[PDB]
mmCIF file of C-alpha atoms and ligand atoms in Angstrom:
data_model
loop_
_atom_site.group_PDB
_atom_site.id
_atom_site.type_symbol
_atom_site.label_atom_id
_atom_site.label_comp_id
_atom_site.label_asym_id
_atom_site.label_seq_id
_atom_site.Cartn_x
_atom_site.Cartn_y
_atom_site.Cartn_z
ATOM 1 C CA UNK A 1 103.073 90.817 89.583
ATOM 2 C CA UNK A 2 103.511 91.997 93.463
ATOM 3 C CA UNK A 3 103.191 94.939 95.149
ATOM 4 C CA UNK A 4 106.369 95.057 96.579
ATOM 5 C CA UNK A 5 109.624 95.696 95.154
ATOM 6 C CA UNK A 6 112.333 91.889 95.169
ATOM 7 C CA UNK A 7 115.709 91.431 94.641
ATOM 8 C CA UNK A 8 117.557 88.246 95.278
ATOM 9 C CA UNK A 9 121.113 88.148 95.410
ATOM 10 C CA UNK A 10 123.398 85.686 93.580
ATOM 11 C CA UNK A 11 124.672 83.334 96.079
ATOM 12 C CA UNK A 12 128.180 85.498 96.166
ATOM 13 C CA UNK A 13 126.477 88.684 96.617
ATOM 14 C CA UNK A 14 125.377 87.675 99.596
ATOM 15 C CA UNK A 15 128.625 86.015 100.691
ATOM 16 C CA UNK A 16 130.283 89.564 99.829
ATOM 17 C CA UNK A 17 127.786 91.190 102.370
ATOM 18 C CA UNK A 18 128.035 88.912 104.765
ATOM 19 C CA UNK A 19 131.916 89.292 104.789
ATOM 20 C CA UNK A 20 131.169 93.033 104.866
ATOM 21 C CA UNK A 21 129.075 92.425 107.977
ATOM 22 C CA UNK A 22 131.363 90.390 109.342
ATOM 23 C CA UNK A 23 134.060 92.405 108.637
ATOM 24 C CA UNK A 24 132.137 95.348 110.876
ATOM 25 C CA UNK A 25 131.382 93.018 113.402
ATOM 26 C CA UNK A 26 134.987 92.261 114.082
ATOM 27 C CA UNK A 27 136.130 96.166 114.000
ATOM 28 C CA UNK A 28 133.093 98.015 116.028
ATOM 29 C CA UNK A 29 131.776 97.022 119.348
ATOM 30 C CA UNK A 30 128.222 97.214 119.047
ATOM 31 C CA UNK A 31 126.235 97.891 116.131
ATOM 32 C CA UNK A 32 124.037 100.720 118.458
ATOM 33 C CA UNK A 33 127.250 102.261 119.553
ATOM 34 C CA UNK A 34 127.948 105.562 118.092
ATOM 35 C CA UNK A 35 131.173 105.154 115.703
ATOM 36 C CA UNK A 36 129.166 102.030 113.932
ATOM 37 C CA UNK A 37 125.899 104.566 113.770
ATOM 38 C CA UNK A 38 127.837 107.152 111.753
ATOM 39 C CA UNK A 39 130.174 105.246 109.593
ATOM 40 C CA UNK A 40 127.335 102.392 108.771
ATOM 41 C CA UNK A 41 125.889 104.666 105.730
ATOM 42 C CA UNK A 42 129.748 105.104 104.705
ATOM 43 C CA UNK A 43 130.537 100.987 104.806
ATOM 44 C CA UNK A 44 127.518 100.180 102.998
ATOM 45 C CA UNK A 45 128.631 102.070 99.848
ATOM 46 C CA UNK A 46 130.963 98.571 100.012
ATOM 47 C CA UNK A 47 128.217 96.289 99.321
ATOM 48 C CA UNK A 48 127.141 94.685 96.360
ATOM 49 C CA UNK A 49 126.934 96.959 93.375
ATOM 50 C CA UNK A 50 123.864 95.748 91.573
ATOM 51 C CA UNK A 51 122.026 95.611 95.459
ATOM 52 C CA UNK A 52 123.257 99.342 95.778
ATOM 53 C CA UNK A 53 121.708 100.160 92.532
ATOM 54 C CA UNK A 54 118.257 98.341 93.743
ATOM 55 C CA UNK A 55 117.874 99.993 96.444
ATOM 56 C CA UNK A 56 118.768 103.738 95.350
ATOM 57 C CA UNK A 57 116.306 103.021 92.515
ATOM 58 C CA UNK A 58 113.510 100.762 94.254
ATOM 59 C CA UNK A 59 113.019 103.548 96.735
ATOM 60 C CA UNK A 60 112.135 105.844 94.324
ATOM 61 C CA UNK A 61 109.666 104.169 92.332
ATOM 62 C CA UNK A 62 106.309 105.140 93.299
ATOM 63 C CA UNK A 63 104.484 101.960 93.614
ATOM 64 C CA UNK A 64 106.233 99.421 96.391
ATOM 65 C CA UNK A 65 104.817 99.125 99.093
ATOM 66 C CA UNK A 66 108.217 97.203 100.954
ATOM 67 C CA UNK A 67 111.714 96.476 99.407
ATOM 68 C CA UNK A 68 112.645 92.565 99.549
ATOM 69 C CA UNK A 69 115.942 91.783 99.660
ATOM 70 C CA UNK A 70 116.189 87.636 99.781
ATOM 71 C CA UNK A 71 119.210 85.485 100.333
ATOM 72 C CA UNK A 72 121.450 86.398 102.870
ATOM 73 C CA UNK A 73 122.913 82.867 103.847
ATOM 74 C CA UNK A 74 121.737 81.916 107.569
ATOM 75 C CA UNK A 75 123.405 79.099 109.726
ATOM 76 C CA UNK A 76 121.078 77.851 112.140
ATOM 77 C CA UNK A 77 123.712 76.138 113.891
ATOM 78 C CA UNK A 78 125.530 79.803 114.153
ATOM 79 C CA UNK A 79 123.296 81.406 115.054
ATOM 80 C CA UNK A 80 122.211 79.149 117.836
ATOM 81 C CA UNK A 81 118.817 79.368 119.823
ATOM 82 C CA UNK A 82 115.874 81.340 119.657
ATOM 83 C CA UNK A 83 116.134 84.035 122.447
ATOM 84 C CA UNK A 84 113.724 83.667 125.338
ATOM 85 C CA UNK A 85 113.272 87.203 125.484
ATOM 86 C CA UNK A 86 114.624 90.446 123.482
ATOM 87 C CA UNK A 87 116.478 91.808 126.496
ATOM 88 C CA UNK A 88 119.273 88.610 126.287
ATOM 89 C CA UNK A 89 118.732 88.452 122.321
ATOM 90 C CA UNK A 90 121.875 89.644 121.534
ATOM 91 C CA UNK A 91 123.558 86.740 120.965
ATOM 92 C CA UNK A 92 126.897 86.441 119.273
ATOM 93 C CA UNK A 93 125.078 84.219 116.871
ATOM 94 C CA UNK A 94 122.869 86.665 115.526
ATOM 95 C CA UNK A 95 125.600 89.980 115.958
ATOM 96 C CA UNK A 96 126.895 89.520 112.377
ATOM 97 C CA UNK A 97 123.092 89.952 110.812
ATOM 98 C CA UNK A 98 122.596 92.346 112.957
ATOM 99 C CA UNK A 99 125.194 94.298 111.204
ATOM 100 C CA UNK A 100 123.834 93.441 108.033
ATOM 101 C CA UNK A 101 120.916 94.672 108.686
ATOM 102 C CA UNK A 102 122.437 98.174 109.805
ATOM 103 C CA UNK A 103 124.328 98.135 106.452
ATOM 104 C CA UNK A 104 121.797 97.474 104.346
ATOM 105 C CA UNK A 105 118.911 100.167 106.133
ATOM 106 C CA UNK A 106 121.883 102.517 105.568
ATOM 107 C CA UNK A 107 121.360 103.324 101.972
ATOM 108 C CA UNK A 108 117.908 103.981 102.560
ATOM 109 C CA UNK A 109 118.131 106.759 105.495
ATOM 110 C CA UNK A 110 119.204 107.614 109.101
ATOM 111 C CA UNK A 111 118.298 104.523 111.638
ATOM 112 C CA UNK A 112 116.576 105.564 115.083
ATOM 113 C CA UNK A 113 115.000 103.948 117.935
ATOM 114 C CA UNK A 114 112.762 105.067 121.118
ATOM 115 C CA UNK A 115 114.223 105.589 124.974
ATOM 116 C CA UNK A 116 110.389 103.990 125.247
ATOM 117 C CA UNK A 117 111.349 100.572 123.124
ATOM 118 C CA UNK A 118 113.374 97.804 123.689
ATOM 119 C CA UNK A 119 115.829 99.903 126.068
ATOM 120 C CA UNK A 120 116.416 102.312 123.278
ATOM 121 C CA UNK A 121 118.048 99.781 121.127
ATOM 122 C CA UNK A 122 118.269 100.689 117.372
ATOM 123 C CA UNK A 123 118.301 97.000 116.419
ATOM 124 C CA UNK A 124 115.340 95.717 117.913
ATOM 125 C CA UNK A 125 113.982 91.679 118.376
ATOM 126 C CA UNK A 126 110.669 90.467 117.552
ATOM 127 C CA UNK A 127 110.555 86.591 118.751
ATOM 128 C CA UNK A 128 107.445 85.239 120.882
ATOM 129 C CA UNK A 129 107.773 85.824 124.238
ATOM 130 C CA UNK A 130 106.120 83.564 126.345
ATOM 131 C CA UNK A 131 103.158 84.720 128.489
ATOM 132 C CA UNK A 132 102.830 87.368 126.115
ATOM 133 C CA UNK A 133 101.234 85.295 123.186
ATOM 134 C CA UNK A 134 97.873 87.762 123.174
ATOM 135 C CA UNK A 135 99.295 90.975 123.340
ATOM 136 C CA UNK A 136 99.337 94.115 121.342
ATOM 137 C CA UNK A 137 102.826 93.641 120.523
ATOM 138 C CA UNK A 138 105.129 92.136 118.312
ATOM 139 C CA UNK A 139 106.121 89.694 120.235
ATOM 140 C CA UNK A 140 102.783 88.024 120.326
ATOM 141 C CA UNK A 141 102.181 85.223 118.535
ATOM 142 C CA UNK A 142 98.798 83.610 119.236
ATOM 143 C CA UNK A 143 96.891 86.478 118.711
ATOM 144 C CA UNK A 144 97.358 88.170 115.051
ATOM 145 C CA UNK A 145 99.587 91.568 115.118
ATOM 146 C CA UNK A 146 96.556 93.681 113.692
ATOM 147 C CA UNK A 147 97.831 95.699 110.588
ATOM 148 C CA UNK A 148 98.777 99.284 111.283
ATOM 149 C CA UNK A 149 101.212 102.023 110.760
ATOM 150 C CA UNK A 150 104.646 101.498 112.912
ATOM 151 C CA UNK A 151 104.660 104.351 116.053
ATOM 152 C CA UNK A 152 101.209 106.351 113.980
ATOM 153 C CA UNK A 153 100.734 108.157 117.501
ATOM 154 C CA UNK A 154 104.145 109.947 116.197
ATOM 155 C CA UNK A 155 105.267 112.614 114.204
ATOM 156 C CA UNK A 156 108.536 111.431 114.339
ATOM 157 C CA UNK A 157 107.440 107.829 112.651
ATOM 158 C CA UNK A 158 109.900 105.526 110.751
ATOM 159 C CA UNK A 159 109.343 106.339 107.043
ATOM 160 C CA UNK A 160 110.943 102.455 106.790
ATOM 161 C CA UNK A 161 110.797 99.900 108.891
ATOM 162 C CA UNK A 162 113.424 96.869 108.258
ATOM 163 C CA UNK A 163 112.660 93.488 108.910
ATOM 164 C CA UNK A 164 115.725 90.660 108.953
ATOM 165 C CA UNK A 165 114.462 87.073 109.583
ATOM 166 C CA UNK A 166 116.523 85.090 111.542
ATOM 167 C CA UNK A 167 114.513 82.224 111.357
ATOM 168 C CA UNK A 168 111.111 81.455 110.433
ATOM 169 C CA UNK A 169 111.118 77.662 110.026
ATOM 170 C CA UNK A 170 107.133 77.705 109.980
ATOM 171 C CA UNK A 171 106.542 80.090 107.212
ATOM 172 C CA UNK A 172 104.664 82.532 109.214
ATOM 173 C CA UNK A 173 103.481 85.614 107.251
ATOM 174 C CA UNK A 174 103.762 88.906 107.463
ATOM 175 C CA UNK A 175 100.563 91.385 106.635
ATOM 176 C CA UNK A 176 100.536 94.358 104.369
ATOM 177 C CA UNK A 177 98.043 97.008 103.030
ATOM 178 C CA UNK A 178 98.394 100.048 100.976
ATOM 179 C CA UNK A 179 95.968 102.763 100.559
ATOM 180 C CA UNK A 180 92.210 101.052 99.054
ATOM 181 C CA UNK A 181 92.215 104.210 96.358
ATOM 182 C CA UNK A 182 90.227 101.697 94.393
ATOM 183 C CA UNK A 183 87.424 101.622 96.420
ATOM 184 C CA UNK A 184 87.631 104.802 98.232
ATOM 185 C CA UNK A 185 84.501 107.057 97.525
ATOM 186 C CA UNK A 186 85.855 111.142 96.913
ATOM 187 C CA UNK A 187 83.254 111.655 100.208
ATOM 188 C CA UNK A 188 85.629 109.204 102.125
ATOM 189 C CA UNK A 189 88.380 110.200 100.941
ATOM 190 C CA UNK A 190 87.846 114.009 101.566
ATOM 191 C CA UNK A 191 87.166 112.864 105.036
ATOM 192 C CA UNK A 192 90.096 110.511 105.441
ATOM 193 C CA UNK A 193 92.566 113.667 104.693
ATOM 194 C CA UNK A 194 90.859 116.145 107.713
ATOM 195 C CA UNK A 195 92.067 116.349 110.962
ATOM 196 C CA UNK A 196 89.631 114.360 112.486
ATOM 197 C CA UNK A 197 90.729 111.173 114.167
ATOM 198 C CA UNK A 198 92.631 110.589 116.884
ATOM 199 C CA UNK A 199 95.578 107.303 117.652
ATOM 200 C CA UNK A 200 96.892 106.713 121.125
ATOM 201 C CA UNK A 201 100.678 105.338 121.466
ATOM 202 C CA UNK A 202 100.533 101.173 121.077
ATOM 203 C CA UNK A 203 101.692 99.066 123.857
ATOM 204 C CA UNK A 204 105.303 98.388 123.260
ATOM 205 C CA UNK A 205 105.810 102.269 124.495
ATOM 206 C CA UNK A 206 104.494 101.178 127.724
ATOM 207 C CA UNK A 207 107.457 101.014 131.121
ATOM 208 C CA UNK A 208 106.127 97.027 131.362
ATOM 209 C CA UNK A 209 107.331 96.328 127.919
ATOM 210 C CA UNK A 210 110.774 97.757 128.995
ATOM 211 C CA UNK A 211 113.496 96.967 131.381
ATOM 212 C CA UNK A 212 112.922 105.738 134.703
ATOM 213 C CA UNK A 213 113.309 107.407 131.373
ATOM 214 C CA UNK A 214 111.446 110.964 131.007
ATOM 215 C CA UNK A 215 110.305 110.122 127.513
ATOM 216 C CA UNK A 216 107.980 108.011 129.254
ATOM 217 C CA UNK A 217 105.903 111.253 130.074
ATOM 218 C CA UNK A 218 105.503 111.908 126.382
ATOM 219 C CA UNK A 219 103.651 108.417 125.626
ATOM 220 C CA UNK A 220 101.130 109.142 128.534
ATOM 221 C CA UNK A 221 100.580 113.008 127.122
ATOM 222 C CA UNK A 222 100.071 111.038 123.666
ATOM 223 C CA UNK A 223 97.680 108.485 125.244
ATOM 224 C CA UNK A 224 95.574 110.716 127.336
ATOM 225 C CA UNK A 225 95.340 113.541 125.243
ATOM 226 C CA UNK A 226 96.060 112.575 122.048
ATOM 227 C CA UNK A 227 95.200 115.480 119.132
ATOM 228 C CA UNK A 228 93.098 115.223 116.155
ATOM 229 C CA UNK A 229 95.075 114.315 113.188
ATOM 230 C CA UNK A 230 94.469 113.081 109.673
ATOM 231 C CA UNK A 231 94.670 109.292 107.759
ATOM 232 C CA UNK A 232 95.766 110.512 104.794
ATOM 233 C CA UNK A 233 98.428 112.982 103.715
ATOM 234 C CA UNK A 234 99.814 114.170 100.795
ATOM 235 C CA UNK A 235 98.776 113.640 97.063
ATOM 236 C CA UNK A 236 95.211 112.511 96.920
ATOM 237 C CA UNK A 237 95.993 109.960 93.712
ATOM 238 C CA UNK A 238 98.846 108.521 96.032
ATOM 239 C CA UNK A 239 98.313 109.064 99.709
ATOM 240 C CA UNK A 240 100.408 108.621 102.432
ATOM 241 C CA UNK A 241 98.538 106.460 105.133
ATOM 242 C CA UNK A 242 98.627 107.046 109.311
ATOM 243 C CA UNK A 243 96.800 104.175 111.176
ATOM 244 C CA UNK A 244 96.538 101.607 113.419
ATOM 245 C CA UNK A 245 93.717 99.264 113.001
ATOM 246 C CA UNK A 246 93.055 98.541 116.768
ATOM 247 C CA UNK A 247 93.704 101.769 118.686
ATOM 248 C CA UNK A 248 92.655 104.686 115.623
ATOM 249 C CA UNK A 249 89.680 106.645 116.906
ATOM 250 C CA UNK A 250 87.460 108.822 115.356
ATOM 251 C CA UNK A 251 87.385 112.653 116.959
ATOM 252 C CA UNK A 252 85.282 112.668 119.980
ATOM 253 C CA UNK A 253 81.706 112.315 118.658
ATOM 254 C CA UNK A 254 82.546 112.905 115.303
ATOM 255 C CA UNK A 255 80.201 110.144 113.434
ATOM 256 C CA UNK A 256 80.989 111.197 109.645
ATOM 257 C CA UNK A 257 84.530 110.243 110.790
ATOM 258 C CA UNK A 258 83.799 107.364 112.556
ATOM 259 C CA UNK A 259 82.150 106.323 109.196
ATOM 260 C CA UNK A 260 85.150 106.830 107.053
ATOM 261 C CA UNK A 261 87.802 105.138 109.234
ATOM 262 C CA UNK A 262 84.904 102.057 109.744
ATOM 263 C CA UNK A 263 85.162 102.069 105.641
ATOM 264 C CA UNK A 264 88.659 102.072 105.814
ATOM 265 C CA UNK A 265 89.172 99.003 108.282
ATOM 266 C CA UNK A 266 86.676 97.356 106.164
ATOM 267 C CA UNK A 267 88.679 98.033 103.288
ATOM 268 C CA UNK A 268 91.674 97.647 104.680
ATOM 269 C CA UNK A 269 90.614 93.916 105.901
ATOM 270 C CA UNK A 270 89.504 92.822 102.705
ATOM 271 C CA UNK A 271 92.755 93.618 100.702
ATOM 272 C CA UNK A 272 95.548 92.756 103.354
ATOM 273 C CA UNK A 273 97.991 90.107 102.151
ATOM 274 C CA UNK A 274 100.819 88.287 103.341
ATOM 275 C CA UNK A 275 104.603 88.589 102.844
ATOM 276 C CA UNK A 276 106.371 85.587 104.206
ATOM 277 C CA UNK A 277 110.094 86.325 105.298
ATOM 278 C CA UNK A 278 112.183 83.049 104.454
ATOM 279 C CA UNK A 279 115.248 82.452 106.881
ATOM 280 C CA UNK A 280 117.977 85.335 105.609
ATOM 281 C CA UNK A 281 115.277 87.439 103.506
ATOM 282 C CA UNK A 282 114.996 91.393 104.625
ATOM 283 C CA UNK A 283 111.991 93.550 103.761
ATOM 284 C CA UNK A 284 112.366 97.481 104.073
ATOM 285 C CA UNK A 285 108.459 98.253 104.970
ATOM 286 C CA UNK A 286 107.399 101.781 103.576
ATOM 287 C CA UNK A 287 105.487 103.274 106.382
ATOM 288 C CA UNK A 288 103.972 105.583 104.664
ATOM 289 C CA UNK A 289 102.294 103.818 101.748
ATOM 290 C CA UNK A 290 101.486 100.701 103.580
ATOM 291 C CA UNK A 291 100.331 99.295 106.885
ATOM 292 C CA UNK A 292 101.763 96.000 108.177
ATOM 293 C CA UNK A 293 101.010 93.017 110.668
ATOM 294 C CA UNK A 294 101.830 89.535 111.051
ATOM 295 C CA UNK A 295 100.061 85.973 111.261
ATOM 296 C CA UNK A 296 98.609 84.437 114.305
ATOM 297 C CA UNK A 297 100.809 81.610 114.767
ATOM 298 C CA UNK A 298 101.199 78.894 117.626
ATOM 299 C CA UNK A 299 104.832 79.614 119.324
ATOM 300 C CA UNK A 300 107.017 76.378 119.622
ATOM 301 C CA UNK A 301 109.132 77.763 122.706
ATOM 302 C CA UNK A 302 111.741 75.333 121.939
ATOM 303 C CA UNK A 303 114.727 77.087 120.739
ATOM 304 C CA UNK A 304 113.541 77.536 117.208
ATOM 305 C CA UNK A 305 110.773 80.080 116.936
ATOM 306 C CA UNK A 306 110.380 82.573 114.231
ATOM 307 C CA UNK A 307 112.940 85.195 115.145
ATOM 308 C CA UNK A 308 113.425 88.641 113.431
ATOM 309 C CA UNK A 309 115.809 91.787 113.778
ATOM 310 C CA UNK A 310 114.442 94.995 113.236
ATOM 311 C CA UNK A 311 115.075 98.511 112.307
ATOM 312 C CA UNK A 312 113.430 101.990 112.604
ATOM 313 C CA UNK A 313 114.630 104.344 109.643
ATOM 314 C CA UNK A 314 113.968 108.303 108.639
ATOM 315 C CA UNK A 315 114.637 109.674 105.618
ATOM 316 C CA UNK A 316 115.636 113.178 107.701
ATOM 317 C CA UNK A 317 116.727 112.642 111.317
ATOM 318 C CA UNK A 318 116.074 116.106 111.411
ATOM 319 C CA UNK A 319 112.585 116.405 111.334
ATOM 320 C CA UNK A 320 112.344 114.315 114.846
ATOM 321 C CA UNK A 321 115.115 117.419 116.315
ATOM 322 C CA UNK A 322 112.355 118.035 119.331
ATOM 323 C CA UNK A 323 112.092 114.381 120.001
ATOM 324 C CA UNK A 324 116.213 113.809 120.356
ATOM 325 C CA UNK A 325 116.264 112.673 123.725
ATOM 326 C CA UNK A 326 119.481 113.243 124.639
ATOM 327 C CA UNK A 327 121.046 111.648 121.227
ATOM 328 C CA UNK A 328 119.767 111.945 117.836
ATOM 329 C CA UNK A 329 119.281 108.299 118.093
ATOM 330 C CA UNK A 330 116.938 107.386 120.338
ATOM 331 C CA UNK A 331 113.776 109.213 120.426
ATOM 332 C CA UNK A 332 111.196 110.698 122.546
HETATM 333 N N1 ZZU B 1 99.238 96.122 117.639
HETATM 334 C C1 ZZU B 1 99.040 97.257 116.979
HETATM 335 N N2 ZZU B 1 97.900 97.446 116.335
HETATM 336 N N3 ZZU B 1 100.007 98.183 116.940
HETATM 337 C C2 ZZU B 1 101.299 98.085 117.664
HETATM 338 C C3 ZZU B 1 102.371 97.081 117.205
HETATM 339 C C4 ZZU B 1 103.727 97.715 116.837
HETATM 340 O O1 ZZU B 1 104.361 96.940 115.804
HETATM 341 C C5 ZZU B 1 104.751 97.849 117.982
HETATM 342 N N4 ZZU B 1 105.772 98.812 117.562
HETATM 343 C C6 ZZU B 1 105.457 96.527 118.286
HETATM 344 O O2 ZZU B 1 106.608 96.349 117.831
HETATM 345 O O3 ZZU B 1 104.884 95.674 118.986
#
């Protein structure tokens, strides 16, 4: 048994996506650009039949707390060296699986990014960047990515977050939790669900983790006056879960919170466990069941380091209509 949801496609499955991806490559400019945005969810009614069915029915069970999707053929020799930094990761090598992953994140909901992230890219990088192994962010390496809830300062939060590996020729894990309803007293709990804790934006919403924009001005009103909020949301057998393990606060003062978010780290900590995305495999995160992280590893910083693309997805682009800076797409 595992608490996510797997599929693994039959070797042509995946040669039919990748064709499909290829196929998109060679008829849209960029995967970011806006003709590929809109006709992406359109395309990927193309793919694999038995995938399509996984995924409209995985996302509706109530138990997963990520989709798996494993293998999607990778050629390292394609694909060619591990990026030295996000900004210059958009290598031909990589552009058809970038498609792919566009395709695929397309019959779950609407992809997004952030005018704060990664130049407001919608397909995002996360490779170690060197200098930066003991950072907050995800392209750390030496220091563990502590488990929390993808953009939890935000409203406006992926409700998936897709993960292609590249490469990963170390086996280097990836961290999940859900909710610990088994060991959550109804005192905690009760707590957990008031408005009574506080986040701050993490560091990759920072100007020197980018190449201004305006949106910049809403991550410092979210840092410096961030406003209460709650943990958990929703049904109290099945909550939904807003944290980050590092920069989640209790209210000012506010010891009986303090308590219950101490509880929940502790929790938290004790029943985290690791995902490890082989070359070609794809995990859909669900954001809102689940908190996520990944390994400390050493970085090799020889043209083969663990390399992933990335994805921000909504089920409603609507509900982030205040945040549409500019385009629906990029947020802030
Ligand atoms: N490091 C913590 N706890 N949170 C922020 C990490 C996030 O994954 C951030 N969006 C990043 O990609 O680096």
């Amino acid at each position: 048994v595992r608490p996510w949801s797997e599929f693994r496609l039959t070797p042509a499955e995946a040669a039919a996506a990748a064709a499909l991806a290829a196929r998109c490559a060679q008829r849209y400019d960029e995967t970011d650009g806006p003709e590929f945005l809109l006709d992406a969810p359109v395309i990927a009614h193309e793919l694999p039949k038995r995938l399509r069915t996984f995924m409209a029915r995985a996302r509706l069970d109530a138990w997963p707390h990520a989709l798996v999707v494993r293998g999607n053929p990778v050629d390292d020799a394609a694909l060619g060296s591990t990026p030295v930094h996000w900004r210059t990761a958009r290598t031909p090598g990589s552009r058809p699986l970038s498609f792919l992953l566009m395709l695929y994140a397309g019959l779950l909901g609407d992809v997004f990014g952030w005018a704060t992230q990664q130049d407001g890219r919608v397909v995002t990088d996360v490779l170690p960047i060197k200098g930066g192994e003991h950072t907050l962010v995800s392209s750390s390496s030496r220091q563990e990515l502590g488990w929390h809830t993808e953009d939890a300062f935000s409203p406006y939060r992926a409700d998936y977050v897709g993960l292609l590996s590249l490469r990963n020729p170390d086996g280097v894990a990836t961290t999940l939790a859900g909710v610990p309803l088994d060991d959550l007293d109804e005192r905690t709990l009760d707590v957990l669900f008031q408005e009574r804790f506080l986040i701050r934006p993490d560091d990759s919403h920072l100007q020197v983790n980018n190449s201004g924009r305006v949106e910049f001005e809403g991550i410092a009103q979210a840092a410096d006056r961030p406003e209460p909020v709650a943990i958990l949301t929703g049904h109290r057998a099945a909550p939904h879960l807003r944290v980050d393990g590092d920069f989640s606060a209790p209210a000012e003062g506010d010891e009986e919170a303090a308590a219950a978010l101490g509880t929940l780290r502790k929790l938290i900590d004790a029943s985290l466990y690791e995902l490890v995305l082989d070359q070609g495999d794809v995990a859909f995160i669900d954001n809102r069941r689940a908190v996520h992280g990944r390994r400390a590893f050493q970085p090799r910083y020889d043209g083969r380091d663990r390399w992933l693309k990335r994805i921000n997805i909504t089920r409603d682009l609507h509900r982030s209509r205040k945040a549409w800076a500019g385009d629906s797409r990029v947020l802030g």
